[PDB]
């Protein structure tokens, strides 16, 4: 939460984004999350058009990896255009699980 050196830390976040390479397969950040029972409930709560966009991006990246190839550089996901589409649905599923758990001990 520093205010003067949050330009330094904005550059480290960009460096780590490029060094990880899901953008070279045309993926977004929320495509790569590990699917536990919590994440599987947020997936089935998505609207139809966002669910269909996610199934095609994953299928295309799984096909590039079978061939040991990547996309042309003009089609790499940019750092400022990655949409965190799954994050508001996941925070609500987790908040409901904490409430069933505080109820069971009290």
């Amino acid at each position: 939460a520093v205010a003067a050196s949050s330009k330094w830390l904005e550059g480290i976040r960009k460096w780590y984004y490029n060094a990880a390479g899901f953008n070279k397969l045309g993926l977004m950040r929320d495509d790569t999350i590990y699917e536990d029972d919590d994440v599987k409930e947020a997936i089935r709560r998505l609207p139809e058009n966002l669910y269909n966009d996610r199934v095609f991006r994953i299928k295309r990246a799984l096909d590039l990896t079978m061939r040991q190839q990547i996309l042309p550089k003009e089609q790499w996901t940019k750092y400022e255009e990655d949409k965190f589409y799954l994050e508001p649905y996941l925070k609500e599923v987790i908040r409901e699980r904490k409430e069933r758990e505080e109820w069971a001990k009290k």
Binding site: R44, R45, P47, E96, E99, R100, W103
Partner: protein
């Protein structure tokens, strides 16, 4: 004592409370909503709104509502008719201020999330099939569709093509236009009067006036037949009568008890029912007859209801209809009008006896008339009905245009023109 405190807020809300000293409390919210306010593009929205009382709201999740009410042993229920919706909460006297906050969240701040509304659509099919195991449920929905062209023709249950397609935006539009403060009555039975008022300014912040202007109901004289495999024939035959809260409506109530409106003795032969004795002169099979009455804010229906075997259905309907003609040309004894007034008075005092019947009686008075009347004022209106007013109500039935609905094996049932 303390008969009732009655207050109108400056934007329409009606608040009424009675302080008993009973161990249990009951609180109800009564709204002018219901199936007469939907048009042909959103049929069945009121049925799904009735089933959605324990979904997530802005102040409590769906887990907290079910767990919080069950922790103190309370109840929550919704009752609807063609013109009204009623939300009721009851528990023990020390817990009632916990359940009041839940009731104001269900009615004044609902959310309608997509994934919860989509899982509820299959409940519409279960609730309708349970209700239609009674053969009177489908006959009485077909009778309202035969009698009207719009508004009161709409059923209480969602149509079959429409199950699966009630959207969250249709639910948001219905509540925003019909659940407003000038259409609402808040009625308390074991609470105080200043505590309900402070509850009332927590939903006086929004939904401030009248809603929209449903249309007048136009009368249609129609017929709906339904051939099926049921073992008995149900049939109903009505005409247009009189609206709730007029001097002719009291005359139709007296005429219902002259003809007969249900038995008083377990397994008794109905010795003082006029309709039952006339049918039993020539029909020696099992049957049942009754007079039917239904009063609304701008119209009413009155007629007869028969249950018979299939080969006897025309004999029963003609014998019953011939008895109403005898009354309409003057044959009406004075000791019969007096015994009908006794059954009507005693039935009214027995129906306000429990806490559920009393709360319903006060809530329907506040929506239609905007006041409360004691049962001694009601009992005077019944005694002021004259014998000529009862004969005049039986002439309005006989000369009026008929509607009909029937179901069963209809191969010996008459058509409405025969």
């Amino acid at each position: 004592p303390q008969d009732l405190e009655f207050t109108r807020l400056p934007n329409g809300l009606v608040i009424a409370s009675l302080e008993n000293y009973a161990p249990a409390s009951r609180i109800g919210l009564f709204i002018k909503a219901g199936s007469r306010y939907e048009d042909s593009n959103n049929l069945g929205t009121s049925h799904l709104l009735r089933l959605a009382s324990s979904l997530t709201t802005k102040g409590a999740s769906s887990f907290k509502i079910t767990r919080g009410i069950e922790a103190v042993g309370g109840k929550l229920s919704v009752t609807s008719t063609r013109e009204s919706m009623a939300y009721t909460v009851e528990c023990l006297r020390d817990d009632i201020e916990i359940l009041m906050e839940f009731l104001l969240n269900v009615t004044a701040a609902p959310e309608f999330r997509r994934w919860e509304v989509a899982a509820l659509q299959s409940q519409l099919r279960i609730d309708k099939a349970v209700a239609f195991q009674n053969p009177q449920a489908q006959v009485l929905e077909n009778l309202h569709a035969a009698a009207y062209r719009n508004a009161l023709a709409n059923s209480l249950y969602c149509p079959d093509y429409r199950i699966g397609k009630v959207t969250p935006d249709q639910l948001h539009y219905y509540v925003q236009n019909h659940f407003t403060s000038a259409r609402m009555a808040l009625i308390g039975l074991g609470v105080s009067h200043p505590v309900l008022k402070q509850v009332a300014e927590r939903f006086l912040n929004m939904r401030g006036g009248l809603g929209l202007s449903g249309a007048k109901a136009k009368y249609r004289g129609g017929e709906i037949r339904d051939q099926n495999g049921d073992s008995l024939v149900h049939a109903a035959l009505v005409a247009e009568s009189a609206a709730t809260g007029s001097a002719e409506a009291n005359a139709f109530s007296v005429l219902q008890h002259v003809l007969g409106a249900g038995p008083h003795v377990k397994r008794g032969s109905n010795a003082t029912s006029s309709l039952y004795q006339a049918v039993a002169k020539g029909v020696h099979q099992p049957f049942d007859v009754s007079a039917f009455n239904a009063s609304y804010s701008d119209s009413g229906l009155f007629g007869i209801y028969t249950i018979s075997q299939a080969a006897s259905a025309g004999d029963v309907i003609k014998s019953a209809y011939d008895q109403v003609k005898a009354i309409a040309q003057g044959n009406l004894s004075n000791t019969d009008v007096q015994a009908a007034k006794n059954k009507l008075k005693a039935g009214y005092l027995m129906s306000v006896e429990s806490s559920e019947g009393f709360l319903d009686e006060v809530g329907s008075q506040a929506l239609v008339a905007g006041s409360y009347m004691q049962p001694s004022t009601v009992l005077q209106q019944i005694d002021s009905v004259a014998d000529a007013d009862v004969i005049n109500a039986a002439k309005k039935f006989v000369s009026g245009r008929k509607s009909m609905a029937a179901s069963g094996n209809l191969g010996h049932t008459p058509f409405v023109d025969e």
